[PDB]
Design a protein around this nucleic acid. Sequence first.
RNA 1: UUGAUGUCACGGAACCUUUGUUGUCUUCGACAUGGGUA
RNA 2: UACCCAUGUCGAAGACAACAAAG
Lengths: 1482, 63
Amino acid sequence: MTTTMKISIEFLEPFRMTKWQESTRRNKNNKEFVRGQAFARWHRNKKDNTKGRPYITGTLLRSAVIRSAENLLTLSDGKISEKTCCPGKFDTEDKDRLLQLRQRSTLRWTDKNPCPDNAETYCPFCELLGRSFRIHFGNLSLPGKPDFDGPKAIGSQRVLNRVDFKSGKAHDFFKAYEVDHTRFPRFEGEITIDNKVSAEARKLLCDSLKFTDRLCGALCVIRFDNLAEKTAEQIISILDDNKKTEYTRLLADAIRSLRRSSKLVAGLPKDHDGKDDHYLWDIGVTIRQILTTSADTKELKNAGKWREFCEKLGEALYLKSKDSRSVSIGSVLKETVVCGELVAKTPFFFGAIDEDAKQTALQVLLTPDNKYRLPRSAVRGILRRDLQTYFDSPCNAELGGRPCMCKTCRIMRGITVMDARSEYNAPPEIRHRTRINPFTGTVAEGALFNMEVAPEGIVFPFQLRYRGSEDGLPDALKTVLKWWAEGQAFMSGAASTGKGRFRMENAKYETLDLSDENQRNDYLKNWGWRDEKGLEELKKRLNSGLPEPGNYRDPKWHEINVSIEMASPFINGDPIRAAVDKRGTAVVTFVKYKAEGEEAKPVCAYKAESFRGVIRSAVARIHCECLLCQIFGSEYEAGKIRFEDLVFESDPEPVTFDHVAIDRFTGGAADKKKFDDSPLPGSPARPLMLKGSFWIRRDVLEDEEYCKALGKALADVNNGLYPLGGKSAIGYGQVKSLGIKGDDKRISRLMNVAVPEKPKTDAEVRIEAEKVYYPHYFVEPHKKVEREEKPCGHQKFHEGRLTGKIRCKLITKTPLIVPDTSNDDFFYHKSYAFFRLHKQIMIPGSELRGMVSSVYETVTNSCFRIFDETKRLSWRMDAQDFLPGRVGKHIQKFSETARVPFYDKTQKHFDILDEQEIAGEKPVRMWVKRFIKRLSLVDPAWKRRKEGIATFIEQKNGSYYFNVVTNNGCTSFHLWHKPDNFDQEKLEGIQNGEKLDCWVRDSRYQKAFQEIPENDPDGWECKEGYLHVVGPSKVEFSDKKGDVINNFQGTLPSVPNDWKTIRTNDFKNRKRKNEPVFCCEDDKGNYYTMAKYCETFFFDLKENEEYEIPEKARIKYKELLRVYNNNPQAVPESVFQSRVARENVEKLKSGDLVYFKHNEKYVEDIVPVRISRTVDDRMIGKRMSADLRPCHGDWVEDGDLSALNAYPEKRLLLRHPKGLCPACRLFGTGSYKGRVRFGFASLENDPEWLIPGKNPGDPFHGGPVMLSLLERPRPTWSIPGSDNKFKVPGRKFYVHHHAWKTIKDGNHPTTGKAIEQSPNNRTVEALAGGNSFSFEIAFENLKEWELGLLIHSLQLEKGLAHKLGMAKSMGFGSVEIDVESVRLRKDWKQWRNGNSEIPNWLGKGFAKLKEWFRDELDFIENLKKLLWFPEGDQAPRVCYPMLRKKDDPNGNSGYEELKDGEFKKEDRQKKLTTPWTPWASS
Amino acid sequence: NPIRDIQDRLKTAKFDNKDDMMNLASSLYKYEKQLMDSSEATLCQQGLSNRPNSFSQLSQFRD
RNA sequence: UUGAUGUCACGGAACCUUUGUUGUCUUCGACAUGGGUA
RNA sequence: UACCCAUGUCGAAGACAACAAAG
Ligand SMILES: [Zn+2]
Ligand SMILES: [Zn+2]
Ligand SMILES: [Zn+2]
Ligand SMILES: [Zn+2]
């Protein structure tokens, strides 16, 4: 007989579990099996299926109970109740059967020998052991014994590593499953006790059960009595159907960024003009409408459901985008409890990678309910590391063997920490990180990754218990806890980038003496206050504060505070946030989150990784066991410096700046290269403040060499050499001052002739008052572009290279327009103000960079940096080698054509043919007349001069119908003939049968009718053919009455909805009753005049003559259709548009009727209508020398080049063989950072305005001036045909003149009439002449001639000027640059003044130009003539010709008459490549 | 100059010979390695001469 | 779903290295349409 | 199958190229 007591284990922590192993693997030799003998176990229902459930063996619980009983007997001198206990027996002779042996010492209380191996009476400790089944521990299982699919249904596997104390890097790791106590808190089992067991043994068992506090790796209390996949597939299908796959990875991440809130869907960006045509969210139903109904779903109303939905969607889209001994410790035992909080003072990173989520490279550890976890293992490891730091002795222990006996291990064996989680469950933030190639200055290959970051401000509960024989906590533990209470708790990974610094707050402690019987019994009764109720009761009696260490050692890290002050804009790029932000920009600055309570506050910051990288680059150029490896760490050793995020002192609102790239040929915007950015505004008047701090190890701070290195690097940073952030080339991120505090001044100690005038130009341009000159000209480049194989590297300051600064002043010689494009309605008609940054008038560094680059690319003959190489040109034909045809591998040839009247009233064909016959799919049967006979009654007083007899029949309405026989009676025909003078006067009476000799002539009359006209029944064949209807498309629409529409009689009919009901109302020529015309009115479109009444009919089909269509003809046809369907000048009414434009024909199909020209074998050109467009065989980039095209450019050849995608050598197919041109070596290319930075240009004095402002009290705002239409540059004019004789003439430069005066008066610069306001013209705020701006250009590693030629490109000569801003064709924007300061860098400390050595540089520059271009420097003279500012009292007349002379009151010839006169295609390129060549003499 | 090496073995490559193709693959892999590990060889800012023929040979190699 | 006179696994920090960066003037004039007469 | 032209309207570009993790 026996009694069963039921036992329940409640876990207060996530416990640990092993993996199921084969029944043969369950042996002593298996390392993994024996490593996991202190964990929970997984039970498989069937061997080959993972379905199962967790359990805990009774052997583990028995071992824990035995250990607790040893402790309790040691605390009570081995006396349980009256009875005493022997030390027990732990020696077995046949050790091999035992799976495990005791490697720990056995607690000793009494010295007598163990109980006899066969004794009638046994001590209670032996009964608990089992020497006398007296006590049987059973297995513990979940209540009800449920089943789960696998171990992953209850927990997750985590990697737990072991690091080296000296290096700070891990060297091995192991894994285990972690199961949450929130989901599986309780296990149940039974203990069976025989009736013969003594009551003392029962009391010992109960005490050991209440004293057992840890099991399976956790604190325990023992008591005894499919939408996401569908949405993803829909979005993917919409992406592929619209040919927008490239955006998938941008859509994958942005939608993931939506996991924070479902409200963010309503705040998704719209397009410019505010419509739903975003290039991402309106690709489709639109993707925005997919994500809007997904947010209204009842299932996804909860935040957690929305978060899981967004994460699943992002992961799916990302995946698609990718595709023994006996020792006595004594009776003195005390337990110290320390309770408090660990608050994150920096974002923290506890690394844990989930292999079912691959979108993020680095991930943080979370609980199943998406809370942040402070794992027990990390706290224990950090405590061990800090104890080793205190003792200064590493622990050289190895896994296995007897317990280590160093002070660190002795303290750690008495330490218990509790796993913690937060009340904050918001999603972690994602940070982008890259690595920069030191030589080129751009990112390395593959160096782009993501990192999940937990926010700062998260509060973790903290509890630590130390059990030991000492009076209280050890001195080392007190010192470590003092360090933690001061914020020196570096607990997480990624410490070098300021992650995981915690502070311990609200610390309370209490020591309990377990050597006292009363206190020990109270501790046993309340289960040691481990559960929440007992923990609260214990916390009510916790003493505030912590013990003060007797022997305190100083912390090893010291805080150095950084103050950065920047006089320029700043951006830390975050493209993903810019895609879900309502601002609708291309990039926004970095923003992080701070956890306040359970909410998240966004703050703008400078990332710690970026600052670390910039500083590391700074130290590595003024100079593995290198100084850099011992200061900043390496892949082998952890670093000694930890940089943190820098936050701005006063919160700046982001501002949006617009940029566009200008074609070097057309002088206009390049295709698809209009963008914007959202930096943080900075300026000299109101700089940006960046406050932060980093941490440096003391041993580094007391080393002279490391401090000297850091001091020189930070001195160079303070001197502006190293900009912060992105886009420094355009003046962003200039550090004006950097200050370091808190280093005892060990690092901070190290941080500490007029200009020659311009030469006068020799350029002479003679202006005559009679002539009128063109607004722009072209500089024909030289035939040679010098390239170099290897550009200079950004890796060091090379010897013999000049590094420094240029301070310059820009002066306005004519009015300047630099617009502020944030507001389009400053004064629908668009109005703009002058560019300002914080109410300070400025010119962005991008404008000045482009303006100076345009001249530097010309001074040094270089590549055309910006060029639309892939543009294909088209020309309109004029009113013979275009033959009819029907498609389709080949097109057949038709022999002849005829006009079939369709929109007249003479026929009823629209009734008598079906839709397919009209469309041209089915052949038709129509009579064709080719010649019409017209007779004179008398000999003329005419080559045929046919003479024949005529018999009159009838006369009515003047006309005479009669039958005529001629050709000696061979040919007889009937006709009607109107009365003709000198011929019909002979016949005055109607005898009805009179004979008369007459002369019949033949006139060409190519017509075809389905039924023969009843008037003329003679001379018609019956040939088959195809009817080609394009529709009524020859229309001359206008907003004002002309001649035809004004001569209309009656009310003007409305434009009919159908294009088949059109019928001719009026005739242009009424005397001869020809030129039929249909006239109509429609609202603002006003007057439509259709002058086309005959469609075309192709007959005599010759099938044998079919001609091949190569892919060139098809791509040219596709271009023709694209330009037809995307025409801004198209007629408003679609009934007057051709079928290729009316129905949006996107490709040629079999059976379509066309006009083609061909060679002997292949077709050369295909058009859909009689008079159409012709496309060029080459793209425009083939019209210039290969040395002139961009060094790194586009594919102009006939190859896809997408087959070699996912292969790197493709980049070598877009790069020039010889390297980089001088401009690409200085300003940079996509793969190579430039060596020049242009800063913002601030205005020195008060502004001078072109137009006086409305308010006299405000002199910082100016009056508005309205400009004429600004229209696209046309390469068609410069390159007037497909002949090879026509090339790209060169770089376009606009001349300096004063045409802006007429526009300031309000008159058109050509007609002289008023500029009437329209929705397309613009109004601008402009500055006047005499304004001075000051700006700064920074250069590094420049050869002497580069400085000389850059100085020349800035200053040029006196009598020369630059062009900046808008409306350069209207005279605005002449400026001049004079260099005021050239500072040169010789040492990190010494900077010399370089105003003296300006001449030599210039000369050397010119010397280079001599060896490059020997006596052939003629492009320089042309550029000089174009840069030529007109002299005083010398005012040229410069304007654009009008369309026609009738539109120009001045009588100057328009574009049409100029096309065939002075500007004929033959001499157009020579007149437009010769600077200052007139087009009108007046 | 890895790119000059690739150019030479491209101009001398015959696709029938396995040895030439293996050598060309070795040159391409060497250039890839130079790109991966930041070095001075990343300052090779040039392309390939005879773009149509080089493209044809590279596409045949990838086929 | 463990065996028993022998389990320091609270015996082990997923740790160490990496700059969201390189390149780009908010710029600008001749074009669009297809027929008609003999 | 030869000639002949006729009409006067109208905005465009709105991001592109590269890197998407290595040791
Ligand atoms: Zn005993
Ligand atoms: Zn040790
Ligand atoms: Zn090193
Ligand atoms: Zn170039």
